[PDB]
Structure formats: structure tokens, C-alpha cells
């Protein structure tokens, strides 16, 4: 499922991401744009057996378990398959675990390189939420 920017924004606000650990809603929408281009089924194999899954490209070596990654920690205690869903709950819940403090969005290189420092609010202005 590929979301529209406002539809995604609304679902994210609805799941507690607005101002979570001090991060304005714009940051989360901008991260998804650059990580999975709003696609819930985006995947991406890295040289290392690790594979990033879903709308927020969550890693299989540390956060979810795809059962094919050598030395998985599975810190979100979830199978990587669930992160590939139209419903973003599982993805949001794991992202919440990952962002433990006000610098935790650095967990997404795309956000650090393409969103941080820019007008991330632009992604939500004109959206109904």
C-alpha cells in the first residue's frame, strides 16, 4: 500500500507520533518519504544479511526477526513480515521502542541526511488532522 502524505500523517498522529520524544509530526512523514517512498511493502537487502522492512525500513539484524539474518537481536520482539502491512501499528510500535530519546530519529540515516534541518512541517501543511 502506498500512502498519500496526508493519509499517512493522519494515521501517524493517530498512533501517537506527533511530538513523540519532542519530534514534530513532519519528521516522521519526511522519514517515510525518503525511506520507503510511502510504500508499506518496501524491503531492502543490505550487503550484510540484514534486510530493512516496511514503511519505516526497520532492520532485521536488530529490531525484527526475518529468520534469515545471522545474529538477529529482535529488540522489538516482532517478525519482520508483520512490518509489511497496510496497517502501520506494528511499524509504529517498533519505531517507538527505537526512539528512546530526543536524538533517536538518527536511527534513520535518510531522516538525518534529508529531513533534519529542513522544513519538515511542509509535509503536513494543508493536511486535515
Amino acid at each position, epitope marked *: 500500500k502506498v500512502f498519500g502524505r496526508c493519509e499517512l500523517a493522519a494515521a501517524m498522529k493517530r498512533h501517537g507520533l506527533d*511530538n513523540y520524544r*519532542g*519530534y*514534530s509530526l513532519g*519528521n516522521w512523514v519526511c522519514a517515510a518519504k525518503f525511506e520507503s517512498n510511502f510504500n508499506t511493502q518496501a524491503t531492502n537487502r543490505n550487503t550484510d544479511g540484514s534486510t530493512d522492512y516496511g514503511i519505516l525500513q526497520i532492520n532485521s539484524r536488530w529490531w525484527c526477526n526475518d529468520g534469515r539474518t545471522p545474529g538477529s537481536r529482535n529488540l522489538c520482539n516482532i517478525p519482520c513480515s508483520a512490518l509489511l502491512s497496510s496497517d502501520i501499528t506494528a511499524s509504529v510500535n517498533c519505531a517507538k521502542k527505537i526512539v528512546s530519546d530526543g536524538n533517536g530519529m538518527n536511527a534513520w540515516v535518510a531522516w*538525518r541526511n534529508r529531513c*533534519k*534541518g*529542513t*522544513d*519538515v*512541517q511542509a509535509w503536513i*501543511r494543508g493536511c486535515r488532522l
Partner: antibody, heavy 116, light 107 residues
Framework: QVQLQESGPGLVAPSQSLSITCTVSGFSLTGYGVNWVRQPPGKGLEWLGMIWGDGNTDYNSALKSRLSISKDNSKSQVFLKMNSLHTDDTARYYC??????????WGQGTTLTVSS | DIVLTQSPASLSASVGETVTITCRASGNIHNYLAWYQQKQGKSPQLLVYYTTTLADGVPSRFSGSGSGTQYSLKINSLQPEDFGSYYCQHFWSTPRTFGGGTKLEIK
């Protein structure tokens, strides 16, 4: 730790242009915006404009045409240039760091007086 | 531009009192509102961002509220170090503007 400091000319005539510098340390100019704000003697705060981490700029509507903001990421400096100086421009000028829609760290400010 | 109407211009109070400062926006700012405190001869300092969030190190006696167009800063049990000026500022698009300020002084 995060620090911002302004430097400016102090006194300027209308026939002169104005440049104030904001040197920062403790963070990268690519990851944060820097806003310019002024406070005339005994008055309230006035927003002048800003420069995003990406280099884009936005200005105060009424002053846009007299203002120019630029930065040098390598020198860790941001500049505010003003022309067509009025006496109403006399004020304390500040640069502040913007982190995700809030000015979290401010410089001490520099005082400017617009003479005859 | 979205203009902010802050009131009152001045307020006299005693230590221990609870006061309220208000900021009304000419248009919906969607909670993108911050409050600063400025002490005599110092730079403004951040207190509250995104309407209700306290900056680090700010005591819980300060609390923010609001939605849409009306916003308030409540100070519970004023302390000697709370006196000075207070400003609200919005961050909805650009240009940004500040409220006119409120001088909080000793009764």
C-alpha cells in the same frame, strides 16, 4: 556545548550597509536553522528572518526587500545584511538556533544604533 | 501574516500567586507555539514549545495550553526568579511573529 555570538559595527549611518555575524559552535549549520530577531530599546521581540539547514531563507514580509541572510557552513558563521537603514533600525540584534520549531539557544545579542 | 495578540501587557503579582498569560493568533497555528522568558539584561530563554512541552530544566510550575487560536501560559506558585518579560511566538509556516510581550512584576 552549544554557543552563538553576534558581532556587529555598533553605530552606522544611512549611507552605510549593515552586516552582523553570528559565529556558532557545538553544532553543525547543516542540521539546524538559524533565526535573526531584534529588540528595539524597551520594546518587544521582532522576527527578521531565518536560514534553514539546507540554505533556504525566509524573511519578515515588511522587511524582505532590505534584508539578506547567508551562511558559511565551513566557517560556522551566519550573516545578516541590511541596507536602506532607518533610525527605527536601532535595536539589539540576536541570532538564535532553531531546532524542530523552537528557538532553543540564543546568542547574547549585539547593539546597533542608526545615526544621522 | 498570522499576528499574535498577547495580554495583559503587564501583571503585578506576589510570590506564591498563580498567573495566566494569553496569546491569541489571527489564524489557526495548529499548536506550533512557544513561550520564552526574558530577564532584565539577558537573552530570551525557551520555556515551552509545541504548546504544552517544557524545555529541559524548566520547572513544572510552568504549564502551557491551547488549541487552534487561543493559547495560555500558566505559572503556578510564582517564585522570585519568575519575574521578567514573557513572549509567545508561532512557528506555523512563515513569516514567524511574536506576541507583544507581558511584563510580570512584583506586587
Amino acid at each position: 556545548q552549544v554557543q552563538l555570538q553576534e558581532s556587529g559595527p555598533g553605530l552606522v549611518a544611512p549611507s552605510q550597509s549593515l552586516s552582523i555575524t553570528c559565529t556558532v559552535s557545538g553544532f553543525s549549520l547543516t542540521g539546524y536553522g538559524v533565526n535573526w530577531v531584534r529588540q528595539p530599546p524597551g520594546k518587544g521581540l521582532e522576527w527578521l528572518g531565518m536560514i534553514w539547514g539546507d540554505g533556504n531563507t525566509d524573511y519578515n514580509s515588511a522587511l524582505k526587500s532590505r534584508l539578506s541572510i547567508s551562511k558559511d557552513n565551513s566557517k560556522s558563521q551566519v550573516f545578516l545584511k541590511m541596507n536602506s537603514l532607518h533610525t527605527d533600525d536601532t535595536a539589539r540584534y540576536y541570532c538564535a538556533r532553531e531546532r524542530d520549531f523552537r528557538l532553543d539557544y540564543w546568542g547574547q545579542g549585539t547593539t546597533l544604533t542608526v545615526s544621522s | 501574516d498570522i499576528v499574535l495578540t498577547q495580554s495583559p501587557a503587564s501583571l503585578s503579582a506576589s510570590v506564591g500567586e498563580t498567573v495566566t498569560i494569553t496569546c491569541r493568533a489571527s489564524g489557526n497555528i495548529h499548536n506550533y507555539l512557544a513561550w520564552y522568558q526574558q530577564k532584565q539584561g539577558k537573552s530570551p530563554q525557551l520555556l515551552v514549545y509545541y504548546t504544552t512541552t517544557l524545555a529541559d530544566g524548566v520547572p513544572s510550575r510552568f504549564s502551557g495550553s491551547g488549541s487552534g487560536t487561543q493559547y495560555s501560559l500558566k505559572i503556578n506558585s510564582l517564585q522570585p526568579e519568575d519575574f521578567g518579560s514573557y513572549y509567545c511566538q508561532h512557528f506555523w509556516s512563515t513569516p514567524r511573529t511574536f506576541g507583544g510581550g507581558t511584563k510580570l512584576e512584583i506586587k
